Ligand binder design. Structure first.
Ligand SMILES: N[C@@H](CCCC[NH3+])C(=O)O
Ligand SMILES: CC(C)[C@H](N)C(=O)O
Ligand SMILES: [Ar]
Ligand SMILES: [Ar]
Ligand SMILES: [Ar]
Ligand SMILES: [Ar]
Ligand SMILES: [Ar]
Ligand SMILES: [Ar]
Ligand SMILES: [Ar]
Ligand SMILES: [Ar]
Ligand SMILES: [Ar]
Ligand SMILES: [Ar]
Ligand SMILES: [Ar]
Ligand SMILES: [Ar]
Ligand SMILES: [Ar]
Ligand SMILES: [Ar]
Ligand SMILES: [Ar]
Ligand SMILES: [Ar]
Ligand SMILES: [Ar]
Ligand SMILES: [Ar]
Ligand SMILES: [Ar]
Ligand SMILES: [Ar]
Ligand SMILES: [Ca+2]
Ligand SMILES: [Ca+2]
Ligand SMILES: [Ca+2]
Ligand SMILES: [Ca+2]
Ligand SMILES: [Cl-]
Ligand SMILES: [Cl-]
Ligand SMILES: [Cl-]
Ligand SMILES: [Cl-]
Ligand SMILES: [Cl-]
Ligand SMILES: [Cl-]
Ligand SMILES: [Cl-]
Ligand SMILES: [Cl-]
Ligand SMILES: [Cl-]
Ligand SMILES: [Zn+2]
Length: 316
């Protein structure tokens, strides 16, 4: 809508209070004019028509329990925008300030979220397996990272290219969680998954095997489920990125960690400068080595750790 930029206040899925950028025009809308061409949050009203209605609120106060998923989708979209702009000098997902659109209250008891090619979509979960998915900053950032990938490398969502696509979303989702500095970790989805069980998550980057995912190329899934294992084989690459950042010894191969900033820089360069829609794991290694070489020089510790990490996970 056209209106004037306002600042509302509300409570997210995890019960924390935060301010959100809104727009006033009769009602207050979840329309943040402060970032690029705007961040817009919609209500899908438990249906699957998309995007649904731009979120309207009479008083600019968002403390209703129905409000919470909207608050977080909107607020964490804003955090993710800020991450990409400040850390990578990337303006929104297309690098030209495209509007970021999210819908919440998608369907009934929907245990997932996704990027649909145009916007983000968040289920409310069924209350057992998931609580509303936009509650997890890593989830929000994972989904929006898919938009970044679509605009850059364009990795096809199947087999090895699809597992890289997934890993990219887990890596940057995690890097956004660290950037925001609320209870950051190398796990995925821990804030919204199984409210009945503490300490668990959907996937682990530091130890993929925790959740049944492979941590070495030799253990790759080769069947047809899950588009050829895109959320399974991502563990191989997630492990490599974890090792590059944090370091460690994995099946006797030792990796000197170089830290998150350098991980982010190397992978962002690889994504934007080298990968292609059909890149496979070996091509990713080449891209990451070449990116590290570009940034730090062929004889650097950074290049050496990239090579060691891909060695440790069996990617030649
Ligand atoms: N986001 C992952 C895990 C969530 C599935 C559990 N309902 C996928 O789409 O496979
Ligand atoms: C839940 C989220 C992280 C994603 N749609 C899967 O994986
Ligand atoms: Ar909620
Ligand atoms: Ar805030
Ligand atoms: Ar604004
Ligand atoms: Ar934006
Ligand atoms: Ar901007
Ligand atoms: Ar509405
Ligand atoms: Ar309304
Ligand atoms: Ar309202
Ligand atoms: Ar409303
Ligand atoms: Ar973005
Ligand atoms: Ar990756
Ligand atoms: Ar949860
Ligand atoms: Ar694989
Ligand atoms: Ar080891
Ligand atoms: Ar080693
Ligand atoms: Ar770090
Ligand atoms: Ar990458
Ligand atoms: Ar990225
Ligand atoms: Ar391609
Ligand atoms: Ar090394
Ligand atoms: Ca209100
Ligand atoms: Ca966390
Ligand atoms: Ca996490
Ligand atoms: Ca849990
Ligand atoms: Cl006005
Ligand atoms: Cl919260
Ligand atoms: Cl309420
Ligand atoms: Cl736009
Ligand atoms: Cl996904
Ligand atoms: Cl935050
Ligand atoms: Cl699993
Ligand atoms: Cl499947
Ligand atoms: Cl190499
Ligand atoms: Zn994904």
């Amino acid at each position: 809508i056209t209106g004037t930029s306002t600042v509302g206040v509300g409570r997210g899925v995890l019960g924390d209070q935060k301010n959100i950028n809104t727009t006033y025009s009769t009602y207050y809308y979840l329309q943040d004019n402060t970032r690029g061409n705007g961040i817009f949050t919609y209500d899908a009203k438990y249906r699957t028509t998309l995007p649904g209605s731009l979120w309207a609120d009479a008083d600019n106060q968002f403390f209703a329990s129905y409000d919470a998923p909207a608050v977080d989708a909107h607020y964490y979209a804003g955090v993710t925008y800020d991450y990409y702009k400040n850390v990578h000098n990337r303006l929104s997902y297309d690098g030209n300030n495209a509007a970021i659109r999210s819908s919440v209250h998608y369907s009934q008891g929907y245990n997932n979220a996704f990027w649909n090619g145009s916007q983000m979509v968040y289920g409310d979960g069924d209350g057992q397996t998931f609580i509303p998915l936009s509650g997890g900053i890593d989830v929000v950032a994972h989904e929006l990272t898919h938009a970044v990938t679509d605009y850059t490398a364009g990795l096809i969502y199947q087999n090895e290219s699809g597992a890289i696509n997934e890993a990219i979303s887990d890596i940057f989702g995690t890097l956004v969680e660290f950037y925001a500095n609320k209870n950051p970790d190398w796990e995925i989805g821990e804030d919204v998954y199984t409210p009945g069980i503490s300490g668990d998550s959907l996937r682990s980057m530091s130890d993929p095997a925790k959740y049944g995912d492979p941590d070495h190329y030799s253990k790759r899934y080769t069947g047809t489920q899950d588009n050829g294992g895109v959320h399974i084989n991502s563990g191989i690459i997630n492990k490599a990125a974890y090792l590059i950042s944090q370091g460690g010894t994995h099946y006797g191969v030792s990796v000197v960690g170089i830290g998150r900033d350098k991980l982010g820089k190397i992978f962002y360069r690889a994504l934007t400068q080298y990968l292609t829609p059909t890149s496979n794991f070996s091509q990713l290694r080449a891209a990451a080595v070449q990116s590290a070489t570009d940034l730090y020089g062929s004889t650097s510790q950074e290049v050496a750790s990239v090579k060691q990490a891909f060695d440790a996970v069996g990617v030649k």
